[PDB]
């Protein structure tokens, strides 16, 4: 029932080395994610709803788990998800359903 | 010049006695595009321009050029490309950055 | 000792919710998937150790899951199966070879 | 229409060279090829459909038209590499559509 | 605490397996694997360490386990091995950088 | 005799736009790229070297391209690259092979 809450920490916790071990690199890496994300022509939900279809598409539970996290901070609907991971299926097939079912089950539980 | 017209035009040679001779499949094939990519939560546009962020991180030319094409047809705005390109780079890191490029070309090709 | 019987049925859990919130999309799927699988010039046994071998090419446990659940249901026998994960191996390396562990794996839980 | 027989000759070229220059490497790699495409519980054909499978959800060029030749010299039916196609289509989604085309063209160019 | 322990151990319970059913197969891989690593140009460590980066950016659990192992066992610094890491993230990145912090995780873990 | 020459030419014009354009985020991107390249416990030609493999793994002609570029710079010699694709073979089995072959072909051509 936490899943994804331990794999987002654990993960942030190794993370912490890093930031501390190769800064310049995590810097260097901040300022992509940072530039990546910000809003523009795409506002932040979009383009974290982009981000999800590409965490299921790269069968990755680490970033399932942050930008589906993520998505709720933004007020993501159930929807507007739903319809990114249909996406992913259609451009993945049997596999990146399986991974959209995490998606769904991440979104959840970070829900409440 | 006419690089992405002819890599789509030779798919689609090949993929019309695809289509003929694996009717079942390609039916389901296409009834699960046009689920997944219809108006909903998410406009047609932002679903397509999904489709290429995941197209440019399965770093496939031929995807890369039938959604390049889709999305002039639903006017997505360069900057619009340019952002959910982005968003594939900062998911992608360097290999990510060579298939941008082809969907920069694409893009412009399609948009003459 | 029941790793993929819970994936699988995990997995599950959430595809009954797809299957409700978005029924074109998983009607689309599900015939995609009845026309690939079907009985035709390759038996469904055949097809199921292809779709073995694509599963533990892409690496994803829920899928490698599902299909060793119906490998066993087929009757395929543990040499059919080894030998499609020998040609994972082949053309996957070091990777697949883990992959194939666990095909072993889930092919033995759902043996009994 | 010449266009696989210049992909596989031109690795072929390269690879002649990789051979003799590791040829501990290469000897292990002919031993892994050898023993995961021989005759067994499955029959070389079936293996080799496997392998065109395989080809097409790694997205490579260079196998889909290796494995296309030694398709048509074990005589594969035309029909029996339509359904292992459509089980990569299954397993890939949209983007494995793009090397399903680029398997069929392959194969007949490889059929004459 | 011993995730990466575990992820091994039952992975070679698996290989065993394969060591016996299909002997011929197995002894060609190991050929290869010895072939690749052994010394040369470049020494163990330096092959490990590129080993090592391979098993981040296919993200696979099994390679990080047995690499980041093999990597302890040949003396491998935390230093040498972050820097490795940090390539896969520039050419991988936010996916690669989730894998980064398993593979920082795994090597800690058989570090004692 | 020009291949990759041209390949990373194409992709250069492309991308020339592209950092012009997504300044914040092309900036953000070099910086991570200097950042993981930089000489450190690993010199520049070992984490090149990394790189190498890592474009084989990734099937990326333009990645071979100029990290092959970049090999021929830092004056790696023929047996030190012969190694790393050994490594990519054992990790990436048959496709990676067809990948090695592009790094050979592409370091030979930057070698003049
Ligand atoms: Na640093
Ligand atoms: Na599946
Ligand atoms: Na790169
Ligand atoms: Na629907
Ligand atoms: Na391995
Ligand atoms: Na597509
Ligand atoms: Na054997
Ligand atoms: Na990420
Ligand atoms: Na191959």
Known sequence: SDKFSHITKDITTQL????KEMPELMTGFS???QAATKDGALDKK???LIAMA?????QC???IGFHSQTLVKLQATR???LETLGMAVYMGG???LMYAAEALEA???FSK
């Open 79 to 81: 929807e507007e998800l």
């Open 107 to 109: 979104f959840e539980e």
């Open 16 to 19: 912490a080395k890093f930031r």
């Open 31 to 33: 300022s992509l994610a």
């Open 61 to 63: 539970p680490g970033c």
């Open 46 to 48: 979009t383009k974290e």
């Open 54 to 58: 590409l965490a299921v598409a790269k």
């Open 94 to 96: 049997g596999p990146s």
